[PDB]
Amino acid sequence: PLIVPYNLPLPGGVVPRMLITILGTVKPNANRIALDFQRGNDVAFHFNPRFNENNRRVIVCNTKLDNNWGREERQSVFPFESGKPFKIQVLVEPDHFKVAVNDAHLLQYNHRVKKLNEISKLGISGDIDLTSASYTMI
Numbered sequence: 648p649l650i651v652p653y654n655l656p657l658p659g660g661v662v663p664r665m666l667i668t669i670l671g672t673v674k675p676n677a678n679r680i681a682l683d684f685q686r687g688n689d690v691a692f693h694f695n696p697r698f699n700e701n702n703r704r705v706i707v708c709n710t711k712l713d714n715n716w717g718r719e720e721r722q723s724v725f726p727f728e729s730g731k732p733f734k735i736q737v738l739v740e741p742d743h744f745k746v747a748v749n750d751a752h753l754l755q756y757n758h759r760v761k762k763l764n765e766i767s768k769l770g771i772s773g774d775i776d777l778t779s780a781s782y783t784m785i
């Protein structure tokens with residue numbers, strides 16, 4: 648097991664065909680999970696399952712540039728459950744991050760930060776027990 652928050656270095660940045668796999672279990676009565684793909688202080692892709700935003704479960708995705716959050720992209724399909732093991736796979740494609748949860752496609756996020764090679768770390772945080780975080784090329 649890994650200590651949360653966990654920083655996964657992405658040496659030389661991300662590139663198309665890189666697959667990141669995250670295995671963990673959601674804590675009971677979780678509030679949030681977050682993945683933050685970083686370019687220095689900037690957040691290229693923030694992926695943020697929220698378990699109780701005004702008694703709704705929602706995934707919020709966004710980009711933070713110069714300390715400012717941009718336009719949120721919201722997904723109401725919510726495959727995480729409190730107390731239960733999950734797998735998140737993030738596949739870098741030429742034009743977007745593609746995210747699957749428990750083997751099922753969830754969402755795509757168009758690249759707003761376009762210097763992919765500068766996206767050099769992934770932060771994993773939130774209400775989880777983290778089992779594994781790794782990457783491979785497909």
Ligand SMILES: CC(=O)N[C@@H]1[C@@H](O)[C@H](O[C@@H]2O[C@H](CO)[C@H](O)[C@H](O)[C@H]2O)[C@@H](CO)O[C@H]1NC(C)=O
Pocket residue numbers: 693695707708709716717719
């Ligand atoms: C309903 C709505 O628009 N709520 C937003 C919050 O989502 C937003 O929260 C911040 O969201 C960013 C990602 O976009 C990130 O998850 C931060 O950790 C989180 O604090 C908040 C502040 O940017 O703004 C709310 N908007 C309003 C109108 O208050």
